[PDB]
Structure 1
Amino acid sequence: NVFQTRAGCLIGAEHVNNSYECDIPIGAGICASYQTSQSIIAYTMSLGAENSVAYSNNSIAIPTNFTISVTTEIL
Structure 2
Amino acid sequence: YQDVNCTEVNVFQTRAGCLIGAEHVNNSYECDIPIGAGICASYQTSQSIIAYTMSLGAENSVAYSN
Q: TM-score, normalised by structure 1?
A: 0.71
- Residue 21 of structure 1 deviates from its aligned partner by 0.4
Greater strand share, structure number: 1
Gapped regions of structure 1 (runs ≥ 5) = 56-75
In the comparison of the two structures, how many residue pairs are matched?
Answer: 55
Q: Shift of the alpha carbon at 1:51?
A: 1.0
The superposition leaves residues 15-63 of structure 1 with CA deviations (integer Å, 9 ceiling, x where unpaired) of 00000000000000000000010000000000101111111xxxxxxxx
Q: Distance in 1 between matches of 2:27 and 2:34?
A: 16
Distance in 2 of aligned mates of 1:8 and 1:48: 25
Larger Rg: 1
Cα distance, 1:4 vs structure 2: 1.5
Q: Point out where structure 2 has 5 or more consecutive residues left out of the alignment.
A: 1-9
RCO (CA 8 Å, sep 6+): is it higher in 1 or 2?
2
